[PDB]
Design a protein around this ligand. Structure first.
Ligand SMILES: Cc1ccc(C(C)C)c(O)c1
Ligand code: NA
Ligand code: NA
Length: 123
């Protein structure tokens, strides 16, 4: 798996690719990585860009939970891995409550953060 340094490098590269497409500021992005979610459409659709980048989405605009679980195994430092997978399973009902794909990814991500704020990170 990656080390935390490697995981941050990977997340930084994803932020660098996605952030320019949206009106998202360092304050908003740093807060989001810290588990604080601005109610801002540009930030919602940034989360969807990241989810796509990360290979977690399907072409219907839903989160593929199976694929996400497999990425946690591949990528996350072991210590983050059971906790991330347990959070994903706990949060798998959230996306069904939202028609819009940027709501699905934003509110699903917020559910992961609320599950365990100490381990949560986001690009
Ligand atoms: C269940 C669930 C929750 C959150 C995410 C973000 C990475 C968007 C997922 O991919 C899957
Ligand atoms: Na857990
Ligand atoms: Na689901």
């Amino acid at each position: 798996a990656m080390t935390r340094k490697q995981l941050i490098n990977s997340m930084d590269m994803m932020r660098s690719a996605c952030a320019p497409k949206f009106k998202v500021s360092t304050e908003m992005l740093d807060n989001l990585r810290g588990g604080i979610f601005a109610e801002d459409r540009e930030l919602k659709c940034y989360t969807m860009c990241i989810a796509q980048m990360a290979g977690t989405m399907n072409k219907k605009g839903e989160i593929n939970v199976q694929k996400t679980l497999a990425q946690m195994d591949a990528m996350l430092p072991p210590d983050m891995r059971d906790k991330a997978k347990e959070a994903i399973h706990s949060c798998r009902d959230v996306q069904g409550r939202y028609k819009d794909s940027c709501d699905k990814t934003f509110y699903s991500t917020k559910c992961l953060a609320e599950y365990d704020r100490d381990v949560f990170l986001f690009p």
